[model samples]
Target: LISKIPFARLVKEVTDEFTTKDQDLRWQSMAIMALQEASEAYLVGLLEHTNLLALHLVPRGSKRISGLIYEEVRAVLKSFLESVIRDSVTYTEHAKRKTVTSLDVVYALKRQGRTLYGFGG
Candidate 1:
């Protein structure tokens, strides 16, 4: 039943909690839940496409790639989210703000030495 809610709505709920006083732990909990849902969905889509292509290209390997790939992808996704969230918080603090905005995220990525073209316009 909970899966019926839209991703944007879930994010909005988390972000709303983030803006509230004395809700840091609650916000973190919601954010982690959202991240887990998003990561699982993303990994499923990625695996679907890759598995389709791999089956066509290889068609012979007896070994399966599911277990290792799932673990690695989940780890990477969690790490990426952690880094981004941490950097975004830093940017928000530097800007003297409590809420983390999209601009904060862009600046955070930039600070991480990423060159994002056609973004933050």
Candidate 2:
């Protein structure tokens, strides 16, 4: 579900204390708030998928991961999305368009040398 709050406001809320002394708390707070702006179900699914992949990598299953791992993953994903959106806005402006499209995202990724397969339409 999409957040009711505006995206800019959400970003500010999530990153306002990005450089705090309590880095762990800051990351947790950012992750919690950032996830509010995205689909909780999707993010949870991502966490589960990551766990499954980790199990495959470490077949012993004796490795214990930190509880904050999901939060950290969410934070990184949120940051990546923000960057992509920012680049997409730039691409839209460069094309003299008022709206951002999938192509803008594809172009933005291409400019960043992160081209995604099957999404370059």
Candidate 3:
């Protein structure tokens, strides 16, 4: 399945690249974070990829800025994933079901005011 965010690749991929040192050095990786919805459920892997994506967004220019972009983005992404899982799991339980589909995840986040389409009309 495709990720919702505007990012891709494994987390490690990006992390290595982000830590690239200057001079005669090089760097990188996509961080694939697995989010388990249920004990027997699938995973939601959208971590370093997002962070790596942050690095990917870096343009070829000179700039001085503070760090923590990865930290901040990671926390935000983790929370969002958790929130969606919480509500989605609840949504399934509310209907006395066992399977949680994309629609389930979609509606879960929908409570937070994210109108997700395409998975269904």
Candidate 4:
């Protein structure tokens, strides 16, 4: 969900809070490590939430979002939700099934031509 937030606003807000050089260095280092940890936790939460949502709404399936659907944008959101599960499960299983990258989430998204959308890179 944080990945879906606009980073210029979100990241810049965090960056803006640090004005002193020493404070910046300390906070930035913490930020790097903390952000990494936070991101991993975030992805796990997202996966769990998505799995629960899928389990709850699988019966409704595509119809769950039918009412809010905008013909143009609907397909994109639908594809995103579907791809998250498909890609996450595929990647997670791949990690468990074989030797893979230490950070399989990134590799998995790349395999899917997707990203967390937190950083532009």
Pick by lDDT: which candidate is best?
1
Model 2 residue 51 lDDT score: 84
Clash counts per candidate, in order, are: 0, 0, 15, 0
Best by TM-score: 1
Instruction: For model 3, give the RMSD to the true fold.
Output: 15.7
- Per lDDT, what order, best first? 1, 2, 3, 4
Candidate 4 collision pairs: none
Deviation (Å) of 83 in candidate 4: 31
Q: What does candidate 1's lDDT look like per residue over 1-121, in tens digits?
A: 5666676566544544444442332243434454555556556766675798786676434665756765777566545556656665665556655554455544644665445455746
lDDT of 2 by residue, 44-98 (tens): 6566667887965754445556656667766775665566456644555566444
Give each model's whole-structure lDDT. Answer: 0.54, 0.51, 0.43, 0.43
TM-score of 3: 0.41
* TM-score of every prediction relative to native: 0.43, 0.40, 0.41, 0.30
> How are the candidates ranked when ordered by TM-score, highest leading?
1, 3, 2, 4
Over 4 Å off, model 4:
1-13, 18-25, 59-121
Residue-level error in angstroms, candidate 1, position 102: 2.9
Q: Write the per-residue lDDT of candidate 4 for residues 1-121, one digit (tens) a residue.
A: 5565464345434433331222212233333333354345546755776788786575455565754535534344334334533454455455543222224434434554445454545
Give the per-residue lDDT of model 3 (tens digit) for 1-88: 4544333434323432432322232211101222223211322334433456577585333453446655665666556656654564
| Model 2, residue 113: C-alpha shift (Å) | 4.2
